Write an enzyme that holds these catalytic residues in place. Structure first.
Site, PDB file in Angstrom:
ATOM      1  N   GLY A 169       0.804  -1.210   0.000  1.00 34.51           N
ATOM      2  CA  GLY A 169       0.000   0.000   0.000  1.00 34.51           C
ATOM      3  C   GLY A 169       0.838   1.262   0.000  1.00 34.51           C
ATOM      4  CB  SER A 197      -4.775  -1.065  -3.942  1.00 36.84           C
ATOM      5  OG  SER A 197      -4.975   0.033  -4.807  1.00 36.84           O
ATOM      6  CG  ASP A 242      -6.975  -6.647  -3.254  1.00 37.78           C
ATOM      7  OD1 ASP A 242      -6.870  -6.058  -2.157  1.00 37.78           O
ATOM      8  OD2 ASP A 242      -8.049  -7.159  -3.642  1.00 37.78           O
ATOM      9  CD  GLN A 268     -10.589   4.541  14.862  1.00 41.30           C
ATOM     10  OE1 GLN A 268     -10.551   4.929  16.023  1.00 41.30           O
ATOM     11  NE2 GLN A 268      -9.565   4.661  14.035  1.00 41.30           N
ATOM     12  CE1 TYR A 291      -7.317   1.018  10.772  1.00 40.98           C
ATOM     13  CE2 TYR A 291      -7.408   1.865  13.012  1.00 40.98           C
ATOM     14  CZ  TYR A 291      -6.742   1.730  11.802  1.00 40.98           C
ATOM     15  OH  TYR A 291      -5.514   2.330  11.614  1.00 40.98           O
ATOM     16  CE  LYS A 337      -4.283  -1.368  11.288  1.00 42.07           C
ATOM     17  NZ  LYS A 337      -3.350  -0.994  10.181  1.00 42.07           N
TER      18      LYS A 337
HETATM   19  N1  LIG Z   1      -2.985   8.128   9.298  1.00 44.71           N
HETATM   20  C1  LIG Z   1      -3.084   7.665  10.714  1.00 44.71           C
HETATM   21  O1  LIG Z   1      -3.441   8.394  11.575  1.00 44.71           O
HETATM   22  C2  LIG Z   1      -2.723   6.247  11.055  1.00 44.71           C
HETATM   23  C3  LIG Z   1      -2.462   5.965  12.365  1.00 44.71           C
HETATM   24  C4  LIG Z   1      -2.133   4.677  12.732  1.00 44.71           C
HETATM   25  C5  LIG Z   1      -2.064   3.680  11.741  1.00 44.71           C
HETATM   26  N2  LIG Z   1      -2.328   3.956  10.439  1.00 44.71           N
HETATM   27  C6  LIG Z   1      -2.212   2.902   9.500  1.00 44.71           C
HETATM   28  O2  LIG Z   1      -1.177   3.446   8.392  1.00 44.71           O
HETATM   29  C7  LIG Z   1      -1.323   2.652   7.333  1.00 44.71           C
HETATM   30  C8  LIG Z   1      -1.353   3.502   6.045  1.00 44.71           C
HETATM   31  O3  LIG Z   1      -2.490   4.346   6.120  1.00 44.71           O
HETATM   32  P1  LIG Z   1      -2.307   5.928   5.805  1.00 44.71           P
HETATM   33  O4  LIG Z   1      -2.401   6.704   7.087  1.00 44.71           O
HETATM   34  O5  LIG Z   1      -1.012   6.181   5.076  1.00 44.71           O
HETATM   35  O6  LIG Z   1      -3.653   6.399   4.945  1.00 44.71           O
HETATM   36  P2  LIG Z   1      -3.888   6.291   3.331  1.00 44.71           P
HETATM   37  O7  LIG Z   1      -5.334   6.048   3.068  1.00 44.71           O
HETATM   38  O8  LIG Z   1      -3.380   7.544   2.679  1.00 44.71           O
HETATM   39  O9  LIG Z   1      -2.979   5.018   2.786  1.00 44.71           O
HETATM   40  C9  LIG Z   1      -3.539   3.732   2.760  1.00 44.71           C
HETATM   41  C10 LIG Z   1      -2.567   2.900   1.859  1.00 44.71           C
HETATM   42  O10 LIG Z   1      -2.902   1.640   1.870  1.00 44.71           O
HETATM   43  C11 LIG Z   1      -3.340   1.305   0.340  1.00 44.71           C
HETATM   44  N3  LIG Z   1      -4.332   0.262   0.278  1.00 44.71           N
HETATM   45  C12 LIG Z   1      -5.615   0.327   0.679  1.00 44.71           C
HETATM   46  N4  LIG Z   1      -6.189  -0.851   0.416  1.00 44.71           N
HETATM   47  C13 LIG Z   1      -5.269  -1.640  -0.152  1.00 44.71           C
HETATM   48  C14 LIG Z   1      -5.330  -2.925  -0.612  1.00 44.71           C
HETATM   49  N5  LIG Z   1      -6.440  -3.867  -0.632  1.00 44.71           N
HETATM   50  N6  LIG Z   1      -4.242  -3.480  -1.140  1.00 44.71           N
HETATM   51  C15 LIG Z   1      -3.079  -2.800  -1.228  1.00 44.71           C
HETATM   52  N7  LIG Z   1      -3.003  -1.529  -0.779  1.00 44.71           N
HETATM   53  C16 LIG Z   1      -4.115  -0.960  -0.238  1.00 44.71           C
HETATM   54  C17 LIG Z   1      -3.839   2.422  -0.073  1.00 44.71           C
HETATM   55  O11 LIG Z   1      -4.012   2.507  -1.591  1.00 44.71           O
HETATM   56  C18 LIG Z   1      -2.800   3.446   0.440  1.00 44.71           C
HETATM   57  O12 LIG Z   1      -1.645   3.500  -0.294  1.00 44.71           O
HETATM   58  C19 LIG Z   1      -2.665   1.894   7.533  1.00 44.71           C
HETATM   59  O13 LIG Z   1      -2.447   0.571   7.752  1.00 44.71           O
HETATM   60  C20 LIG Z   1      -3.277   2.584   8.788  1.00 44.71           C
HETATM   61  O14 LIG Z   1      -4.158   1.600   9.498  1.00 44.71           O
HETATM   62  C21 LIG Z   1      -2.654   5.255  10.058  1.00 44.71           C
HETATM   63  C1  LIG Z   2      -8.032   6.508  10.766  1.00 45.55           C
HETATM   64  C2  LIG Z   2      -6.884   6.635  11.756  1.00 45.55           C
HETATM   65  O1  LIG Z   2      -6.680   5.348  12.330  1.00 45.55           O
HETATM   66  C3  LIG Z   2      -5.528   5.335  13.173  1.00 45.55           C
HETATM   67  O2  LIG Z   2      -5.246   4.009  13.614  1.00 45.55           O
HETATM   68  C4  LIG Z   2      -5.734   6.233  14.385  1.00 45.55           C
HETATM   69  O3  LIG Z   2      -6.799   5.697  15.175  1.00 45.55           O
HETATM   70  C5  LIG Z   2      -6.071   7.647  13.919  1.00 45.55           C
HETATM   71  O4  LIG Z   2      -6.509   8.438  15.035  1.00 45.55           O
HETATM   72  C6  LIG Z   2      -7.184   7.632  12.879  1.00 45.55           C
HETATM   73  O5  LIG Z   2      -7.320   8.967  12.379  1.00 45.55           O
END
Ligand SMILES: NC(=O)c1ccc[n+]([C@@H]2O[C@H](COP(=O)([O-])OP(=O)(O)OC[C@H]3O[C@@H](n4cnc5c(N)ncnc54)[C@H](O)[C@@H]3O)[C@@H](O)[C@H]2O)c1
Ligand SMILES: C[C@@H]1O[C@H](O)[C@H](O)[C@H](O)[C@H]1O
Ligand SMILES: NC(=O)c1ccc[n+]([C@@H]2O[C@H](COP(=O)([O-])OP(=O)(O)OC[C@H]3O[C@@H](n4cnc5c(N)ncnc54)[C@H](O)[C@@H]3O)[C@@H](O)[C@H]2O)c1
Ligand SMILES: NC(=O)c1ccc[n+]([C@@H]2O[C@H](COP(=O)([O-])OP(=O)(O)OC[C@H]3O[C@@H](n4cnc5c(N)ncnc54)[C@H](O)[C@@H]3O)[C@@H](O)[C@H]2O)c1
Ligand SMILES: NC(=O)c1ccc[n+]([C@@H]2O[C@H](COP(=O)([O-])OP(=O)(O)OC[C@H]3O[C@@H](n4cnc5c(N)ncnc54)[C@H](O)[C@@H]3O)[C@@H](O)[C@H]2O)c1
Ligand SMILES: C[C@@H]1O[C@H](O)[C@H](O)[C@H](O)[C@H]1O
Ligand SMILES: C[C@@H]1O[C@H](O)[C@H](O)[C@H](O)[C@H]1O
Ligand SMILES: C[C@@H]1O[C@H](O)[C@H](O)[C@H](O)[C@H]1O
Ligand SMILES: C[C@@H]1O[C@H](O)[C@H](O)[C@H](O)[C@H]1O
Ligand SMILES: C[C@@H]1O[C@H](O)[C@H](O)[C@H](O)[C@H]1O
Ligand SMILES: C[C@@H]1O[C@H](O)[C@H](O)[C@H](O)[C@H]1O
Ligand SMILES: C[C@@H]1O[C@H](O)[C@H](O)[C@H](O)[C@H]1O
Lengths: 256, 256, 256, 256
Positions: A12, A37, A66, A156, A159, A163
């Site tokens: 991703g 993806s 994916d 969540q 979700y 995690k």
């Molecule tokens: N942004 C936050 O606050 C935060 C905090 C904690 C954890 N996370 C985790 O960080 C990771 C990345 O999320 P992000 O914050 O960069 O947001 P984002 O939506 O910008 O990125 C999500 C990434 O995962 C890709 N993706 C989604 N579905 C997919 C699939 N079936 N196959 C392959 N790729 C796929 C997306 O195309 C994208 O590149 C996630 O796992 C999220 O749970 C985010």
């Molecule tokens: C969607 C994203 O998910 C993360 O795990 C964390 O909980 C962030 O607070 C939220 O903004």
């Protein structure tokens, strides 16, 4: 050059945290497999990152996979081996969080979140670890978990278990893969301003409440996660496995 | 009479921790819905527990409900309302741990472990919480998680994420359901000698290694979890929600 | 050059984890203040490390500072400002673990353990944070806590509370100092073969029991903590504060 | 009558959580040693509680014991044995939290907080455990820790390490005292409206911020901690040791 001559797969990686990690690993010498993806935007973002890495003298390739397809792990590994001859680091980053209340949660939406965030991660980790064990040089696996592995979220409920499950998967894989020098760790981003919470934090009362709770006084950005991820992939973390690393500007600890 | 007049659902209660928990809930005055897997042994064990409960002056019913069938939650609740007119406590206990190495984990076994232990629990909690919300009287939900929500197991890479997931589910549900007075907690048993680890601990070297690691000097038995579950379901815990309770004889803390 | 131009104070750095951390900080470009206990061996070890650092082209000084003397914090900071004109990183490392049973613990030994490991750390952190605040440039504080901040030890009832206390201190200081850009983190080493456990692990049965519990298959060495401390002190960790990092080879997660 | 014929010592029991625990233990059959600070208000409150327990048919005595006096543990045990012939439960509750900023924290105020909250607890636990081991009937020890053992407080840098230290002390004592059937656990109150935070929560903006973060929609009151404490002291918790029990209405988990 903390990652020179290492092959790093990032899932991703078309945007957000995964894109920033992919980009910084290439700056640190690694040959990067940019997993995406397979959607229109995913593929376009992966190729533009590969173009960007080419432009500053690194090597990268884009590979559609994916994460909800339990067979894409082996596809990623096969492509990494074809291009770069090894798999040395896996950054499991693909994930979704479709904010939704608990009592009316649709079964399909729940199953899609577990399938993408946890089940697909399990078999992507499985494929990469299989290759790392065959090679016999050790390896490094990093799961992008969340602060929400430690605390709850009302919207969540589907979700946060994925995690927390990812963190627990790293703990159990650390035992199973330790004798092969494969280190398995979780990074826990706090609140990082990305596409995943753009709509959520468009509520400025929620955005201010969340930002006020961050001791460092700002939400995160994707580059805030690159250093921690590179660290855990590097020899700087040679004795680090089964560990959790919060990257949240102090959000978790800030009760009062 | 800590649970007098309360209607308690226990999933997977034909044997083991669930059987002991349902028995003690009825001893404490509860009307118990003994949920079971729908197998022949599960039916027989649920029915004999109902016989035993009526014998000492309690009320109970046996209800078949495959935890892996995501619709059994509404079936358990419907049977509870039809029989006893309310749902006040859910003890989510059903679970499997088919020990298996990681690198050759088959997808079917992985998917059944997550489906039984986590996905089915999600929608059983949802069904029971929906009914508790409608009644307006509050309620209590207890998920049987595990010490393995906090630590790893090399032959449990498919299992520990479901136990961590259940814990995180209680944390997020605690937030979503708090306004409706529904308390959600996890109980984390240690090594309880039951059917789930009868074969695993038949290896006497592992049995001693685990046992000598228990400061209380013994492995647990199902009745060791009945008190903590009743406590979490009772008014003794009126301000406890989103919590975890290790019931493990000190096993988690014992490093040296 | 992850720490180029930064002034780093390491307490108790004559041997063990502190020696390795100060050495690698200077390798990364830092001007190091090698704090020591004021004993003869501590003085000699601090001075030989200073000799070694100057040899490979670094800058360092040795400064005596009894961690149990609650005024040594301001002395270390003053020596750092006088020599290098700033304080940018504190690695609080000094600590003792005189193994001893609980029921016959003498008050003097208890009080020296808390005074050295926790009380002295509190006021050393205070002195260094005061200087970082005055400078207006941010900074990094790293406390050497322990895996024993998360689990118990029967012969460490006086010691584990100081390691848990240090971790909690980093959490609360992360909040109080976040507005001034001072990041506060704990590093949690596992079983590192050093002077502190040379006698304890001379019992070969305990040594094997502990070692076979490490998934990476070996006990740690001081250099195993240098990478994680440098990471937490560097810009790689710009959004990390109030965090804990296990550096233990998987020891914490390895139940079975 | 969960505690019939058990002798329970509660420290700092003149008001707040300790008073409510002392009162409920006497309602559950226990003979209660009401420990108090020895101040005017402390003694007056302990005697009025003893009067109240006399009025409803229980037995209790008041005993002055300054927790910061490391010798008061043996004084409490000696008095418990004189009146009631045994010591069976220790509830270590005495503690102070003088809110104060970190950078100007006075040395005396810091040392008084560690001395009262942690060091005095260590030797009170030591005296009670010594008696429990001599008797050979097992025992139960409960430390009143805090949610702030898990998270930080900007004005509590001196206090959160004592609460985390208390939790860690219970974990280590669980190992040391397990072979004697002495169970050692921590209870972690969230935000309980008592004298300890009357001035703090007189800031209605802080009170509302804290209350809004509680899923159950209210701050705690002392009686909210009585049930959890009685549970951990009772045979309902026979396999519970080395454990932590949050009692916070969901405060800890409520990120969003
Ligand atoms: N942004 C936050 O606050 C935060 C905090 C904690 C954890 N996370 C985790 O960080 C990771 C990345 O999320 P992000 O914050 O960069 O947001 P984002 O939506 O910008 O990125 C999500 C990434 O995962 C890709 N993706 C989604 N579905 C997919 C699939 N079936 N196959 C392959 N790729 C796929 C997306 O195309 C994208 O590149 C996630 O796992 C999220 O749970 C985010
Ligand atoms: C969607 C994203 O998910 C993360 O795990 C964390 O909980 C962030 O607070 C939220 O903004
Ligand atoms: N025994 C331990 O050491 C331990 C420790 C921590 C957690 N747990 C958990 O406790 C719970 C009970 O396990 P146990 O120790 O009593 O072992 P057990 O195998 O004896 O009992 C498991 C119960 O769950 C039922 N069950 C299994 N699949 C089901 C399904 N699809 N639908 C409905 N019911 C089903 C079983 O019929 C059985 O009654 C499990 O969730 C387990 O993960 C056990
Ligand atoms: N070795 C492990 O397994 C392990 C694990 C986790 C945490 N720790 C912690 O790491 C830190 C360093 O321990 P180590 O493993 O290197 O053992 P060590 O005994 O070899 O080093 C301890 C250092 O602290 C110094 N020191 C002791 N008392 C001092 C005092 N009053 N003032 C100033 N300096 C003093 C010592 O001179 C020595 O250099 C300690 O805080 C320890 O609690 C060690
Ligand atoms: N109220 C909360 O929000 C909260 C939350 C978590 C933990 N706690 C802890 O609960 C425990 C009780 O505090 P409280 O909330 O009931 O507030 P409180 O101020 O009303 O009670 C404090 C009790 O400890 C007694 N005490 C103080 N110093 C003593 C000494 N040297 N010797 C003997 N007794 C002494 C006090 O006289 C009093 O009875 C404390 O340990 C506190 O750290 C409170
Ligand atoms: C993306 C980059 O990552 C590096 O580790 C650096 O140290 C910073 O943290 C960040 O700007
Ligand atoms: C199968 C069972 O699962 C539990 O969660 C724990 O890991 C036990 O040790 C194991 O015996
Ligand atoms: C089954 C029963 O449960 C009760 O809570 C009791 O206190 C004991 O712990 C146990 O024997
Ligand atoms: C003395 C040293 O202390 C550490 O914190 C840990 O407990 C190690 O196992 C022990 O050897
Ligand atoms: C001391 C040195 O520290 C560095 O971070 C390096 O990456 C290694 O881990 C270690 O050999
Ligand atoms: C003084 C009291 O201390 C507790 O441990 C907790 O942190 C509460 O929030 C605070 O009000
Ligand atoms: C003080 C009393 O304690 C009991 O355990 C009861 O169940 C309630 O929780 C409370 O009102």
């Amino acid at each position: 050059s903390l990652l020179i001559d290492k092959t790093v797969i990032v899932t991703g990686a078309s945007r957000g945290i995964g894109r920033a990690a992919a980009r910084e690993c290439a700056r640190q010498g690694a040959r990067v497999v940019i997993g995406h993806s397979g959607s229109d935007e995913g593929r376009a973002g992966a190729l533009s990152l590969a173009e960007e890495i080419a432009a500053f003298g690194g090597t990268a390739i884009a590979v559609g996979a994916d994460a909800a397809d339990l067979d894409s792990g082996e596809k990623l590994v096969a492509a990494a081996v074809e291009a770069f001859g090894s798999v040395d680091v896996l950054v499991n980053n693909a994930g979704i969080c479709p904010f939704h209340s608990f009592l009316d949660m649709p079964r399909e939406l729940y199953l899609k979140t577990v399938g993408t965030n946890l089940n697909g991660a399990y078999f992507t980790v499985q494929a990469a670890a299989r290759r790392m064990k065959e090679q016999g040089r050790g390896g490094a696996i990093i799961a992008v978990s969340s602060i929400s592995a430690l605390v709850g979220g009302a919207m969540q409920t589907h979700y946060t278990p994925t995690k927390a499950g990812l963190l627990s998967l790293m703990q159990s894989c650390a035992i199973a893969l330790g004798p092969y020098g494969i280190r398995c760790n979780a990074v826990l981003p706090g609140t990082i301003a990305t596409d995943i919470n753009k709509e959520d934090l468009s509520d400025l009362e929620k955005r201010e409440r969340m930002t006020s709770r961050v001791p460092l006084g700002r939400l995160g950005e994707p580059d805030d996660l690159a250093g921690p991820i590179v660290f855990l992939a590097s020899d700087m973390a040679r004795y680090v496995t089964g560990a959790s690393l919060l990257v949240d500007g102090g959000l978790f600890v800030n009760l009062q």
